[model samples]
Structure formats: structure tokens, C-alpha cells
Target: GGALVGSSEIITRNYGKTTIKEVVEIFDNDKNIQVLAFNTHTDNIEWAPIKAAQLTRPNAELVELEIDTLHGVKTIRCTPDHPVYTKNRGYVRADELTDDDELVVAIMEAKTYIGKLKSRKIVSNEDTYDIQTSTHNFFANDILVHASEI
Candidate 1:
């Protein structure tokens, strides 16, 4: 029964960031396919079978794509994040953030656009009023504009 070959075999291969050091398997005299796999954050191996046709790798890097309409063309490296208050107290991305979220602070790009919401109390004559003030700064290539916030 063991004339041609042995009943078991071991193989090693390297795929992506993972390396298959030792793989022991029983020979069944059947055809099989090779695949690429990677470990996930949970230590689970996810397999990606090789396709018959040629395929390209997917792009996984985040690129800055915001275009300054008023301030001219500028590439902002940092993510456009704004602070939200109320039940949730954290920064939200610009695309998903809304006006109803009570944005207290926001910074689109470093030294480019920064905003801060402030509250003040004023007394005139015999009446007292509470007012909310918005402060912002816009730095351009040539000049800087202050107090542009609403």
C-alpha cells in the first residue's frame, strides 16, 4: 500500500505577511488549490483563494482628498474632525457630522482652519442676556483672516 509514496506529507509556503512553517496533510490522490490567508485582529485566519484570472491588490491606505474651494487648492493631511457634545462626547468625521450634534470645536487642517464655540453673558441697563459666540481662524498663503466663525 505504501509503494509509490507515503500516506502523509508536510509542506511549507509563504503568503503575504504570514508564513506557513509546517503543514502536515494526508494524501488522498485528489487535486487541490492553493490560497493566501492572513490573520485578523482576533487571531483568526482569513483565507483568500487565488482566482483563475489575474487580479490586483486592493488599496488600503487613507489619502487626503479635501479641496479648499475658497482658500484655493490645498492638501490637508489630518482628518477633518469636529468635537460633538451631548450624549456622545467625542470627535466625529466631517462627512458624518451634522449641525444638530452641537459642535463645540473643530479643526480641519493644522494651521489652516480652527473653530471654537464660546458662551458669554452680557448685562446692559437692567437686562441680562446669554449669548453664544463662534470663533474661527483662517490662514491663507498670503494673509490670515481672524474671527470668521459664526
Candidate 2:
């Protein structure tokens, strides 16, 4: 597979266009690691599954971000027992998540997308400057940030 140009961004860094192979390699390198995905309070996002890399150990910790656009609130949480609970022990803790974790992550995803579309539409209708200005600002804020460019 190939990468999409200027499609992926991580840590405020954009990779321009990229391919799937490039993405896999980047994934292996812990680049473009997205701990959380988009979320909307009105949408059903609490059931979203964590990406493969997010569950990995020794590279990155799994984080859940819940943003309430209406309330302008954002909360971040991390897994405490991640990266294997007992590596030295004879047995290791389950790699899968607990029931509570599933729900928490799902809800967090939904919160990320709240008010996103409305904001874009508002910007599109506004005449702050030229049409390009409106489109550019709308795209940068509404699409770039919400596209999960990671």
C-alpha cells in the first residue's frame, strides 16, 4: 500500500502525502501514534476500539481524550497498568481491555467530534474575508483537526 500526500500529521508535524507502506513503517517507528480518535457526544463513539499501536507496550501508552465542545471541556486519561502488568511474573496480565476501559474509550472518542460540523458550517457561511479565506480557515480548523490526520 501507498501513503497519502500531506495526509498524516502527528505532534503538530505533517508528513505531507504518504502511502500505506510508509504508514506501516512509521507505525513501527512510533510515528503518527494516535492515542485517541474522534468523538462526538451526540454520536455513538463509546464503542470505538483502540488502534493496534495504541495497545502496544514500551512504545506508547493508551490515552483517552474526552472533549465536550458544548461545555468547552477536555479531559485526558491514561492506562495505569498498561505495557504488561507483570512481565517478570510467570503469567502476564490480559492484553485485552476490561469492560470499563471499553466504555471509557468509546465515550472519549465521541466527545472529540462534538460541535465540529457546526463550526465548519458557520465558518463556510461567514464572510470574514475572501471566499478562500473562509474556505481555508474552515478547512484548517474543521477538516485538518477533525480528519484524524494522524
Candidate 3:
């Protein structure tokens, strides 16, 4: 499926940073939506088509992940992501991440660095959607993830 968080999740996309709620409005204005996220093969951040920016679920249980990044230790919120790109170990889902797990941080348009998976937690459950990009991966809360997880 797509992303799993709501308005609280703001994303770092090609159009600059925006919240999923705001993406809905943006997506309306431009049907051909492209979201900037990570490309595993290329090992870089790129813009890809955003298909379903509409609401997918409501008040659902979500997870909170704390990642130590170049920007500093930041926390991101999401459901158990299908897979989040990591360092030597790649494609580790949310709940299964180990203390030694790593992530790629989006510092700028063409710059990124690996970080550590510091911790994780739970949220109050929210109305979520798939800020889904073709890559199913993006940086949010300054952390590497699919869609805006924070």
C-alpha cells in the first residue's frame, strides 16, 4: 500500500516541504504529482510520481521511530513501513529495526548521509493516507521513510 500517517506528517519533497493534508490540495491542482524521495538502486533522492494522495484509512495505530541523523536525533511517525532504506543493512521495516539499524538522511536535493535507528514508540492513532511515491520512500521529520511519517 501507501504511507500511513496523517496531517501531522510533513514531508521533504520536490515541491519543498509539505504536509500530507496539504499534498491533497496540491495533488488536486496537479493530477500528475511527483514526490521527492529515496531511490534504492541509485542510492540518492529523486522525484517520482505520487499516485494515491487521498485518504486511505482513519484513526489507525501508528509507530514512532527515533533516528539519529546529520541534522541531529529526530523522531518520525508512521505505520510499520513496508521497508525503510538503511546503511549496510537495507530495507528494514519499522517494528523490526534493530538498535544497530541505519537510515539515509536527506540533507538537501542531492545530498544525503546514513544515520542510526535510536528508538521507537506508539501514537494516538490517526486518519492516515498514502503520501505514496513510486519509490515508496521519502524523508520526513528529517528521517528516511516512505511518505511523510512525522
Candidate 4:
């Protein structure tokens, strides 16, 4: 499924929107982690179970983004193939996004909105992890991203 590497932030039910590398350790060897994600069938916000938690593919390519918005500085760190929702354009691959592109992000408690991608950084050697959940989509920071498939 679509994976986030090191420093990738996610919005959780218990914890605030924080890095995947940081928050995941707090699980203490738990089987699964619950996250604020979408119910694919109903298209509603719900707490979905993280079914898979595997740290995979060291040196994987990563796309780091910093969005410029009135809300504040927003960021993203994910694989190039990761699904990122766009405004009007709908879903697009992370690599397809441009510095001038507008993005759709889901607020932690409030909801979703759009913003501009100010900077886009690409790299490798990140600790990439997969969170293939019950619901394929999850709130990574305020930005809601999709899972590729099991």
C-alpha cells in the first residue's frame, strides 16, 4: 500500500498529527494502531485499524513537501508513487505534484481544505513504513493520502 517514510506525519485518534517514525514506537509492540481515516464504503470519517506495520525498503525514494498556507507551514514525506489528493484535479501521484500545485488536506478534527505546495524535495535512505489499514485512506498530517492496495 501507499507508504510514508521517515518523518512522515499522521493524524491519530489518541495522538496528535505527528511523525510516523516518532508516534509508532509509542505503540509498544501493539498489534495495530487506530487512526482517523475514511470509511471507503460510506465515505465517512472513522477510526480505522492499521492492519499492517512493516518497515520496508531502506534507501527508498521520498518526496518531501512543504505547503504554504494561511493555516501555517504544512509538510509531507512520502514515496513518489503515494497517492496525494489534489484540488479539482482529484487524486494524483506524489511525484506528479508541482511547487505551484494546490493540495487537499484533512484537518485533524475540523475537516479538509486546499493549499499550495511551496517546496517539493526529493530524496532517499528514509525508513519507509506501510500502514495498510482497514480503510485505504488515512490522514497523514492534515493531508489525507490513499493506500495503493494490499
Displacement of the residue 16 alpha carbon in candidate 1, Å? 44
TM-score of every model versus the real structure: 0.17, 0.19, 0.82, 0.78
Question: Compared with the true structure, what per-residue lDDT tens digits does model 1 show for residues 7-84?
Answer: 111111232121111111211221132322222233222233222211011221222322333344432211122112
In angstroms, the error of model 1 at 62 is 3.3
Candidate 3: stretches off by over 4 Å? 8-14, 147-150
| C-alpha RMSD of candidate 2 | 18.4
Ranking by lDDT: 4, 3, 2, 1
Q: Give the candidates in order of TM-score, highest first.
A: 3, 4, 2, 1
lDDT of 2 by residue, 1-150 (tens): 001112222221244333322434566665443322223333232222213222122222333323233445333222222111111231112233232221211223234332211110011111011011111111111111222212
Question: Which segments of candidate 2 are over 4 A away from where they belong?
Answer: 1-7, 11-23, 29-32, 42-150
Query: What lDDT is obtained when candidate 1 is compared to the true structure?
Result: 0.21
Error of 1 at 48 (Å): 50
- What candidate 4 gets wrong by more than 4 Å, as runs, is 15-18, 22-28, 39-44, 99-102
Q: How many residue pairs clash in each candidate?
A: 0, 20, 1, 2
Pairing residues by index, what is the TM-score of model 1? 0.17
- Which one is best on TM-score? 3
Clashes of 4: 2
Error of 4 at 104 (Å): 2.4
Cα lDDT of model 3 overall? 0.69
